[PDB]
From a paper:
The basic unit of chromatin is the nucleosome core particle, which contains 145–147 base pairs of DNA. The DNA binds on the surface of the histone octamer, composed of two copies of the four core histones, H2A, H2B, H3, and H4. On the other hand, the N-terminal tails of the four core histones and the C-terminal tail of histone H2A protrude from the nucleosome core particle.
The N-terminal tail of histone H2A is exposed on the disk face of the nucleosome, and is close to the H2B C-terminal tail. Thus, we concluded that the impact on the nucleosome structure upon the truncation of the H2A N-terminal residues 1–9 is minimal. In the nucleosomes containing tlH2A and tlH4, the initial phase of the disruption occurred at slightly higher temperatures than that of the wt nucleosome, suggesting that the nucleosome stability was not affected by the deletion of H2A residues 1–9 or H4 residues 1–15.
Residue numbers in the entry:
A (entry chain F): 20 to 101
B (entry chain E): 38 to 135
C (entry chain H): 33 to 123
D (entry chain G): 16 to 118
E (entry chain C): 12 to 118
F (entry chain D): 30 to 124
G (entry chain A): 39 to 134
H (entry chain B): 26 to 102
DNA sequence: TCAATATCCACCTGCAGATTCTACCAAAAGTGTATTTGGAAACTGCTCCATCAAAAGGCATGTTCAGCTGAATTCAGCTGAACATGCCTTTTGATGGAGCAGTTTCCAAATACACTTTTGGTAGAATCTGCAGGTGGATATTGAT
DNA sequence: ATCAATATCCACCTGCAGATTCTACCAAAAGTGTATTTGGAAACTGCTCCATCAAAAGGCATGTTCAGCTGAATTCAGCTGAACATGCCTTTTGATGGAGCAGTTTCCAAATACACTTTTGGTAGAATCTGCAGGTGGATATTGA
């Protein structure tokens, strides 16, 4: 089935929850749409590179290292997947 | 009925979610979004159970971290409520997009 | 002894702006630039190869690395001009 | 010369030796040096072209660092690429926040 | 006579040979001295010993006998030096140090 | 038909027992620890690689490693770091 | 005739942004450079150029830090950069 | 570090496009600049020492700036 | 505006510090040949990943209400800018001496190879066991009177 | 100054999904016997890098005046937090089909390795030149009346 507008899937209660762990006590109402905008940019950039690595390896499957190497590029070095 | 004053449960939650480590976004919606974004780059891609988990670990991490800097930016403006400009300042200083 | 991309930058300078010349320091900035990118590009290419248990850096590594290293249109164009040069050199 | 063979100014020889003596990989393919050289050339082209303009715009016939910075920072893409680099003697793009202005 | 693992030779728990082999196949250099693998295995052993120690303590504080990430996070984020060493790194499942801005607390 | 993969798992565990005999570590945490050692490994060696180069050297000595360590590690982590290394190399050559 | 407060500043800003010369005194800096160096290693000698690097790097950084500083002051409605601003910027950049 | 006079700092804050400057800034800015230099130089030297030299060349600085993610153009690559 | 500062700002112009152009001498870069290999192409065993189906309760949504935060004003204390001064620490400019990056030129010690054994580790199975997930009073912590 | 009203702790329970161990093969360190180098070590340049030494001249430090920016204190419109009811969709669990990773073979096509010949690119003279740096003369941008 056709995937569309799934950025909306990142609900407001969730974003709050992520804001709570961040240490925010009060959240403006405009924040929710702004956060999505940023998350979708972060993701794009990280997935874009990931896939570039999947392509150079000539695979159809994005593997966890692909992501990790990708995160490493953007200096968002992840520990725990390889 | 008994009622908690505004902000009191906000503080309650902060302690709650900071003491825990589970992921705060629902798994399926995130997996969906990941495939949508990835699909618009290369068609017929497949993902390792873990590859998606990775992405979600990074994402949540990134955002939680942004919200901290975000919140220090609201505090600096004498405010107590984070706003977009609070989020943007933090990203300008960080250098994500000056 | 010692070497620099001064000669080549200057040649390139001429094609695009025959009338203009370039100072010492500015020349020096250009050298720094070439080397850097060179390193970035070569470094990543090294990395690609390695992830792929490869022992040889093909021009494919260079190209892919350039996709990862350069932004938007700078990237598109860079692949072209470099692929063009290989098509040509090879034949 | 290999470089004219690839119709390039940049030394395809020099780069090949640089890649061999660079520790990047166990062995370097023939197309590598060419490919990269051309990319180093093109990027050079691109920055000089803009500098030229800048220099031209300033009324000079000699490209200097300031011309390079103006060139670099004004274009978004080159700015992304040299985002964590500083041109010595470059200066900064003139920018004064609105609020600071006279009302 | 019987062979001495080079690691035992230097009195190290980490694998000095494994390290030497990774230094060569790594393409970091054309050649590798015999002391480098040793020296390095040692630095990696001690750093591993360093974060393991603080982690265990944190597992202790929480009445658990098995170290999990959270403990590693807690370890890494509280020591000033490890926290700087792993400043741009994120521990999957590690959470964040509990910290509430003073202004946000009740009157 | 098997595909053998390696990690410093076994070694980390050996060190885990020395500091805390009664403590144990989970898979995930063992994973974290594995990433750690590699990260560091590549950082140290990569810096080593640079040093040798900036100095027209074709061999990475245990000496380069050490300067690498000084440049990469902060404060006492580095002080103590170097102590273990040196000790390890001295003891190795002698026996 | 007296120029109202702050008018000059804008003229100082327009001016200095327009140039690219260093703005810290050569000798005092070099003196600063050697001093710090000597606390690390002694009887060191600097290449003339080395000090230019160090000064070029320092100034560039400092000017940049002020742009982020300013933005932090404006964000608080103030128009005068203060130490909290400088600290906020550094804290966000990840320097401390 | 006191050699870094207040009127020069103001200039720096001016290029940064700052209109008004609190009085404490100056001691503050001096602090930060001191840390910058200390960090950049310690690495430079380490590099100088590894080379078994008594002179900190312009390249050592260059290399140490790279390591601090403050890359510099104009003295080497 | 009308005026009276003080400011920029093009227009013009004259040489010395750089630039760019020459003129030659080594170090690479290119050839010619002969080899070593890396890894693409051809199966094919088989994990792992894409998909669906169900039952179920965890939670995202949307609505009321109203507490209290953000924002708009207003005010005046005094901090930091504009200045005109007085004075000295930076400029810079040779001038010289000498610590010292840099080059050689051997060579003894440390490495790289190329094989041949000899263990140490990894990938399954066999055994354990923290601890996740529930339960329940004790203990505050809150918010209304 | 009290007290319900609630949420948060902390300890005891107990099977089970996640370690801990237990065992067998084998890919890889270890052990030797050569075949190169690698990069110190004396010797010595030619540098650049310190050091005085010596004047001038911006450029820094100061002490005045005050203009207007920061700071604090109210007020109130209304935004966003807390709550409840609703009912949708994410979770959990397992079942299957099979696309496409990976592990082996096989071997040309391609990269590596010398040994040599040619040409190019880096240096240090020789030969132009662009801006630097002042110097007028004239709208500009400010500020007061
Ligand atoms: Cl302050
Ligand atoms: Mn789509
Ligand atoms: Mn001029």
């Amino acid at each position: 089935k056709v995937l569309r507008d799934n950025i909306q899937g990142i609900t407001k209660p969730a974003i709050r929850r992520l804001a709570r762990r961040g240490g925010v006590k009060r959240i403006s109402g405009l924040i929710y749409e702004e956060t999505r905008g940023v998350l979708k940019v972060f993701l794009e950039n990280v997935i874009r590179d990931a896939v570039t690595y999947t392509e150079h390896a000539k695979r159809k499957t994005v593997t966890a290292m692909d992501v990790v190497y990708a995160l490493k590029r953007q200096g968002r070095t992840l520990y725990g997947f390889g | 009925p008994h009622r908690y004053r505004p902000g009191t449960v906000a503080l309650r939650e902060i302690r709650r979610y900071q003491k825990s480590t589970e992921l705060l976004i629902r798994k399926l919606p995130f997996q969906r979004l990941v495939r949508e974004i990835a699909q618009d780059f290369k068609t017929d891609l497949r993902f390792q159970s873990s590859a998606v988990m990775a992405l979600q670990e990074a994402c949540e991490a990134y955002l939680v971290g942004l919200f901290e800097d975000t919140n220090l930016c609201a505090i600096h403006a004498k405010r107590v409520t984070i706003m977009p400009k609070d989020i943007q300042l933090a990203r300008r200083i960080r250098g994500e997009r000056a | 002894r010692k070497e620099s991309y001064s000669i080549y930058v200057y040649k390139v300078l001429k094609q695009v702006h025959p009338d203009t010349g370039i100072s010492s320091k500015a020349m020096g900035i250009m050298n720094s630039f070439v080397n850097d990118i060179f390193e970035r590009i070569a470094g990543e290419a090294s990395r690609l190869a390695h992830y792929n248990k490869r022992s040889t850096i093909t021009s494919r590594e260079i190209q892919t690395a350039v996709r990862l290293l350069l932004p938007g249109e700078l990237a598109k164009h860079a692949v072209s001009e470099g692929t063009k040069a290989v098509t040509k050199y090879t034949s | 010369t290999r470089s004219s063979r690839a119709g390039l100014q940049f030394p395809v020889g020099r780069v090949h030796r640089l890649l061999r003596k660079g520790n990047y990989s166990e062995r370097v393919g023939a197309g590598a040096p060419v490919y990269l050289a051309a990319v180093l050339e093109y990027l050079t082209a691109e920055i000089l072209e803009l500098a030229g303009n800048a220099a031209r715009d300033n009324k000079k016939t000699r490209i200097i660092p300031r011309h390079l910075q103006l060139a670099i920072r004004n274009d978004e893409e080159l700015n992304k690429l040299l985002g964590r680099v500083t041109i010595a003697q470059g200066g900064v793009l003139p920018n004064i926040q609105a609020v600071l202005l006279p009302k």
